[PDB]
């Protein structure tokens, strides 16, 4: 087992040059350094450690470091260099599962950290937390150039090689080794009956938990689909921007003549301030002086203003009754513009040269094992029920990738699971009601018949209501779904509690398992805990934030892991079936939002093979962990991500 550290010139998007690299070994204890001219020797050392059957320890190695080596070894000296995924291990993917909660334990330490490093899994932040940090390269280089007198141009100091870079690379691999010893000094994930610094890739993976293996496979696959990208159409979103940027410049002209300006106190100094519809103070004032009473006081002196009170508002003047609808449309158009094209993290500021969007996906960002999406967020674009939704999802298509050998577009397949957490509930409470609840879910659709039984208008409203009732609501927040009062908010709770009297028994079981005493304060809550964590489906200590969200962190943390294994198995069957992953093959993953997957493939027969084998992968997931239910999915085929929603 060796511990390697790299340093190159730029990010993985545009990297062309190698600068330095340090290797430490666990059998000779040698800081074997390398130079810019020793890159062949560096690759030979890594290939020797692979060929003898060992493990290479990087940090952030799956996302950046290993494909940087595969790119540099090709485009600098013309040689193929691939590391097998069962040899490379990471110490960031291990940190995101072992220390999954830094924001709730990092206070009391901020005396150590500067303040910008609060709750960071970066390698320098663990240098500050382990009390082993000797300077920083960027600060010392900036201080050096200000001491010489030449300017500091762009914050790009990895242009030229020097000797301080090697020293801070040595300190970097020191911090990586001192992190690895603590991360392997854990006992719940690594049993203390064997030393993990001399075992092979058949002992290290399969003589420990399954959560240490599934997380590395997920990090590998999600880094690969991050490197693939998402095909994007630019002209069809510039047409949308030029369409609805000539609408908010009419909804203000038509509206400031209705709602006039006023003098507001800044001898009494006044200023001529005009009506700004994006503010929620000007609309509150102009509705206060036009004859409207809120009768809803969230704030202690101000009302609440949102889309559910701008519908139930009536005034005397019949012009303002039409003006309020234009105010709501103006707020919608403003949010649409700021998301699509004018924001700091807009869509048109993260399009590469080849017409694709690369978004970072953190596989373990939530406390319940749910992935987060950032820079930009491709799990937050407007759906097909919101206005201007289909015109925003039609640009995010897979038919915008014309093929590089025949000049033809591709086909997209999208696969969604059905009744995921609601069927995990029937898994978990099947030991109480003897499994006569997990038979009605398999007998026809669940949400449609729930809508029939509860006389909700839409299936989406029934689906919102059932999880709102299930994850511990109050008396009013499920009466608000239909708009009625707390009388209906009580009778719906009684109707869906007296049907299956096992949810309260399961909740009492969770309360008797986790909490033992909870003292009551008139403004707070003081609880003596017994077990703050919950064993998940693969032994991972899932952290619990509040004792009334215990059913939540028991259901969604067990629902995310079956999707996380399903996305791995549905390519482990496709590669073994005789296909090729990537753009130069037959299929490519594009995006993984919390439930469904979006894959793009070359022909319709390959689409049919993928949409067949997704079912077999999901059934193997359902058989591997011995669920008491029967898991099932549903797939669609199309050109873009508006039919394949």
């Amino acid at each position: 087992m060796i511990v390697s550290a790299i340093a190159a010139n730029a990010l993985l998007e545009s990297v062309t040059k190698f600068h330095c690299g340090v290797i430490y070994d666990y059998s000779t204890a040698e800081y074997v350094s390398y130079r810019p001219s020793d890159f062949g020797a560096y690759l030979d050392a890594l290939e020797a450690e692979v060929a003898r059957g060992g493990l290479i320890v990087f940090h952030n190695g799956h996302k950046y470091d290993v494909p940087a080596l595969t790119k540099l070894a090709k485009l600098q000296l013309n040689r193929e260099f691939h590391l097998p995924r069962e040899n490379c291990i990471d110490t960031l993917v291990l940190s995101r599962l072992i220390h999954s909660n830094l924001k709730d334990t990092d206070m009391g330490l901020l005396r150590k950290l500067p303040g910008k490093r609060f709750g960071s899994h970066a390698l320098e932040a663990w240098g500050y937390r382990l009390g082993e940090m000797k300077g920083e390269y960027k600060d010392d280089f900036k201080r050096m150039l200000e001491e010489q007198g030449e300017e500091y141009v762009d914050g790009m100091e990895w242009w030229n090689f020097n000797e301080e870079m090697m020293d801070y690379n040595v300190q970097d691999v020191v911090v990586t080794k001192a992190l690895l010893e603590k991360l392997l000094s854990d006992k719940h994930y690594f049993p203390p009956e064997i030393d993990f610094t001399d075992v092979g890739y058949t002992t290290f993976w399969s003589e420990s938990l399954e959560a240490v293996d599934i997380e590395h496979r997920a990090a590998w696959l999600l880094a690969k689909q991050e490197r693939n990208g998402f095909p994007f159409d630019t002209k069809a979103i510039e047409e949308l921007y030029v369409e609805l940027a000539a609408r908010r410049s009419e909804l203000l002209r038509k509206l400031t003549e209705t709602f006039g300006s006023w003098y507001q106190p800044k001898y009494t100094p006044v200023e001529h301030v005009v009506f700004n519809p994006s503010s929620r103070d000007h609309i509150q004032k102009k509705l206060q002086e036009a004859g409207w009473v809120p009768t809803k006081y969230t704030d202690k002196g101000a009302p609440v203003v949102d889309d559910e009170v701008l519908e139930g508002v009536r005034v005397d003047d019949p012009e303002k009754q039409a003006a309020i609808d234009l105010i709501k449309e103006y707020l919608m158009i403003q949010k649409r513009i700021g998301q699509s094209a004018e924001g700091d993290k807009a869509w048109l500021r993260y399009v590469a040269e080849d017409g694709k969007i690369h978004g970072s996906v953190n596989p373990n960002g939530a406390v319940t094992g749910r992935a987060t999406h950032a820079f930009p967020n491709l799990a937050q674009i407007p759906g097909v029920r919101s206005p201007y939704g289909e015109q925003c999802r039609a640009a995010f298509g897979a038919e915008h990738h014309l093929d590089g050998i025949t000049g033809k577009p591709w086909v997209q397949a999208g696969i969604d699971a059905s009744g995921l957490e609601l069927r995990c509930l029937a898994h978990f409470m099947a030991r109480f009601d003897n499994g006569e609840y997990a038979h009605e879910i398999l007998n026809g659709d669940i949400h449609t018949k729930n809508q029939i039984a509860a006389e909700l208008p839409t299936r989406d409203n029934a689906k919102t209501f059932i999880y709102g009732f299930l994850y511990g609501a109050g008396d009013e927040k499920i009466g608000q779904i239909v708009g009625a009062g707390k009388e209906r908010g009580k009778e719906l709770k009684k109707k869906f509690l007296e049907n299956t009297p096992a949810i309260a028994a399961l909740r009492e079981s969770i309360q008797q398992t986790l909490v033992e005493s909870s003292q009551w304060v008139a403004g707070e809550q003081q609880v003596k805990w017994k077990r703050r964590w919950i064993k998940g489906l693969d032994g991972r200590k899932v952290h619990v934030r509040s004792p009334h969200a215990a059913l939540n962190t028991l259901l969604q943390s067990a629902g995310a892991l079956i999707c996380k294994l399903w996305i791995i198995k549905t390519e482990e069957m496709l590669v073994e079936k005789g296909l090729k992953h990537g753009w130069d093959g037959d299929f490519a993953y594009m995006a993984w939002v919390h439930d469904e997957i979006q894959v793009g493939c070359r022909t319709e027969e390959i689409a049919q093979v993928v949409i067949e084998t997704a079912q077999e992968a999901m059934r193997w997931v359902g058989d591997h962990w011995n669920f008491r239910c029967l898991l099932d999915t549903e797939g669609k085929m199309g050109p873009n991500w508006a039919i394949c929603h």
Partner: protein
Amino acid sequence: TYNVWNFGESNGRYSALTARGISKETCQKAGYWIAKVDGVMYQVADYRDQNGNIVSQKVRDKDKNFKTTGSHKSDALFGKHLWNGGKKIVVTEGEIDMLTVMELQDCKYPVVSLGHGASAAKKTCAANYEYFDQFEQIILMFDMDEAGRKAVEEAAQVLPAGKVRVAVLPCKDANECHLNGHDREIMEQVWNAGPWIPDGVVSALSLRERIREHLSS
């Protein structure tokens, strides 16, 4: 503007250059240093005469401006006083190129620099005809730009013929070839450079490919 700035009254210091690629030993050898006046650190180069007396300062800021402290002559070269003969000189274009070349040879070959650059090179080469007579080979090392080719074309006329050799570079000048690890090419262009070939004259032997392709179209 006032006078020659002393290093004691301006807080001088002979250090290295990290972002350029020049160590402190070569700056100690030449006399390129940094003063602290008016708050902002100002770099300064020293001009000497043939004897060795200080005649001028040249002060550069952090935003690439120029400042002459006094009488600026045309027969003053940056790096001339240290050598009084030899068999091979290398003439540069700017001023950091002299430190770049003397960094990679440990002060073995005479290297001089121009006081104006490529804009007024003919004036400072016409008055410096008598200094280059004691030499044996001259290697001009200018920029790979339009102004650099124009300066190396128009500056080889007032020099003695038979000794002026021109070298080519894949970089802009010597400093990018020092930064990007191209220290094997600049050491060959000094020892083995290109001979006389002014633009306009074409030898009849080295024209085979153009006459081959010319009767094809």
